[PDB]
């Protein structure tokens, strides 16, 4: 009768921002003031819905992607940048919250931690809630490149390279974005 928040908020390893998880959460009775009363999160802000009074009033999804610390400005409705245009764009009528906490002791190692990537270049901006997992080479303006890269043709992905002792703006924040979506349907997840 509960939700799997022990697998979303406490996974051992998150995914990259360009290929973000999304787990449909249904058949629940959910207590949203469990995490809100914990307050171990640097960001917890519920847009549209009333925060901490939302334990009473169809389904919710749960995104999972870890970005650098100063990139949490983009995880909001109506942002631009290298995350809200090319990796994960929230819609204009979002109803839910972004939860981010400084996970520096977990997701970074001595030397580099080149597992988490992002998409520097892309031909157009994302429609809201759309992934892009392609790794074709991005030409800039003119010259076609058949799977090859050089001048004027770049590999689209680029790593973060998390050092354990970077600045506080460049550190892995594990971002979980809950999207509350009510539809013309019988509900399976509500508050107790």
């Amino acid at each position, epitope marked *: 009768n509960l939700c799997p928040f022990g697998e979303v908020f406490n996974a051992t390893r998150f995914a990259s921002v360009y290929a973000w998880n999304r787990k449909r959460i249904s058949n629940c009775v959910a207590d949203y003031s469990v995490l809100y009363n914990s307050a171990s999160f640097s960001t917890f802000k519920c847009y549209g819905v009333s925060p901490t009074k939302l334990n009473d009033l169809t389904n919710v999804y749960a995104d999972s992607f870890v970005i650098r610390g100063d990139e949490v400005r983009q995880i909001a409705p109506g942002q631009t940048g290298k995350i809200a245009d090319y990796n994960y764009k929230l819609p204009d009528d979002f109803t839910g919250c972004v939860i981010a906490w400084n996970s520096n002791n977990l997701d970074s190692k001595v030397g580099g931690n080149y597992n988490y990537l992002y998409r520097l270049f892309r031909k157009s901006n994302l429609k809201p809630f*759309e992934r892009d*997992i392609s*790794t074709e080479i991005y030409q800039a303006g003119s010259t076609p490149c058949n799977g090859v890269e050089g001048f004027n043709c770049y590999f689209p992905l680029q790593s973060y390279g998390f050092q354990p002792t970077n600045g506080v703006g460049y550190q892995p924040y594990r971002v979980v974005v809950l999207s509350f979506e009510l539809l013309h349907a019988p509900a399976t997840v509500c508050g107790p």
Partner: antibody
Amino acid sequence: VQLQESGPGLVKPSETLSLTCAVSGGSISSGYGWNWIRQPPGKGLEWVGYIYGSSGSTNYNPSLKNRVTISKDASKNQFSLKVRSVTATDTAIYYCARDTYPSAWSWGYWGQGVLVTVS
Amino acid sequence: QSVLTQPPSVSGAPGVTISCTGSSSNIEVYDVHWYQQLPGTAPKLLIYDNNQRPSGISDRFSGSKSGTSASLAITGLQTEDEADYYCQSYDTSLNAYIFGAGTRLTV
């Protein structure tokens, strides 16, 4: 919902095969992620393509080098698959699909399928 | 590494455990999704998001994904489950959807 394929099933090598999965019951211009998945008759399934419904950005399988392309004709509510310069190992059973829920990682909602062989 | 691996074939009597173990890039980051394909038919969505069953399903089918290895339990099979069973994760190395090798059930 409903999704029905089409297209010719026999081809000469080094040509372009065209397969349209006509869908019904739901509009293609949505947040849904539409798909192609092929299966050789002996071995088993292997993903080949993907297309997002609203914008139309296409994402392919990089084991196939640059051959595949996916276009979605929105006036008739169908989407295509054109792998070009085919060979004798691209002779499979093709299944169009649609993801379970929006931006999921899997799919129900298949089609019956076709069997395109290349002589 | 970078490939899911099922056993070749499983079998039993009425009264079957199918496991799809993956590498560090396949799962422990992503979700396993089981498909069942009747012989000469389109495959059917069986388990998604590691244990969530879709609309219209039996109850002896259940997924259990813990760590880097998943499993599909079929305890007390019926004689109408003789079909194929594939597993679908997503890889980061080769960066595409990875289907399993394949297995089939025989009563």
